[PDB]
Structure formats: structure tokens, C-alpha cells
Write a protein that binds this ligand. Structure first.
Ligand code: JGD
Length: 149
């Protein structure tokens, strides 16, 4: 699969993260991100996708070595970490044909796994509207501990 790039944006207290909600197959909440174009650099893809989905320009804030990268089913996703963005920033997507809503979420209240269905003696996982964000949550909490305290 083609690699994806985007951002984990936090506010000034470091408590809250910015998620976006799409439609249809992307109907839950996730970090803003998308597919890299031919010959496009990673930092430039991350700024472009984030500006298309939120209207906020990260280009002056990106730090090259401050990101979390995961490989999921053989596709690579890298999210640059962007702290200290004020909670009263006004966000607006380019087209609301792609993005339903944009909200701040408390980091400590978000799940870092889905729940099983062992009460039903049934295999698999229950649905969760944060399914796209979940894989990054534990690594993010660990990264904030190591780099802030
Ligand atoms: C600023 N903010 C939280 C939003 C703006 C645009 N769409 C939804 C929410």
C-alpha cells in the first residue's frame, strides 16, 4: 500500500488531541492523514492532508524527528507530533463532502484497545467509533512521558 502522513495535534495543556470524523468507510473518528503523491516529501504530504481536513497549517511547527510511525497490514502510517495548539483555534475543512466534524478529545479517556465479546462466548472485537485512532494511543502516551515527563 502507498504510505500515509498526517498529524497528532495537542493543545497547550497536553491533555487533549484533535480528531476528525469522515463518512462511509471512514465514518468514525481518526487523526488527520492521507496518501502520499508521486515525488512528494513526507513533511509536505503531512501538511497538505492536515490543511485539507482541518484548515490549519502545520508547516511552521513540524519537527523532523518528532513522530509516531506504525505499519498496519503492510501499509506505513506516520503522524508528526504537534503540541501547544490553542484550544480556541478555528478549524474548517476544505470540503464537508469529506469531513463531517472536528473535535478535541481527552487523551486519558480515549481507549487504547477494543473490547472483546467474552461475555457472549463469541470471538472477535466489539465495534468502536475510535477504531482508526486506537493503534496510536499507547505509543503517544509513552512518547509524551519520555519527551515531557
Ligand atoms: C473548530 N471545530 C471544532 C470545528 C470546525 C469545523 N467543523 C467541525 C468542528
Amino acid at each position: 500500500g502507498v504510505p500515509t502522513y498526517g498529524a497528532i495535534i495537542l493543545d497547550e495543556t497536553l491533555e487533549n488531541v484533535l480528531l476528525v470524523q469522515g463518512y462511509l468507510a471512514k465514518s468514525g473518528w481518526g487523526f488527520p492523514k492521507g496518501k502520499v503523491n508521486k515525488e512528494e516529501a513526507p513533511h509536505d504530504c503531512a501538511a497538505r492532508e492536515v490543511f485539507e481536513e482541518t484548515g490549519f497549517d502545520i508547516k511552521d511547527y513540524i519537527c523532523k524527528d518528532d513522530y509516531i510511525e506504525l505499519r498496519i497490514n503492510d501499509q506505513l502510517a506516520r503522524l508528526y507530533i504537534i503540541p501547544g495548539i490553542p484550544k480556541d483555534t478555528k478549524f474548517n475543512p476544505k470540503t464537508r463532502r469529506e469531513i463531517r466534524n472536528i473535535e478535541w478529545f481527552s487523551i486519558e479517556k480515549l481507549p487504547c484497545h477494543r473490547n472483546d465479546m467474552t461475555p457472549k462466548s463469541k470471538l472477535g472485537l466489539a465495534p468502536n467509533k475510535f477504531f482508526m485512532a486506537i493503534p496510536f494511543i499507547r505509543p503517544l502516551r509513552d512518547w509524551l512521558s519520555r519527551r515531557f515527563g
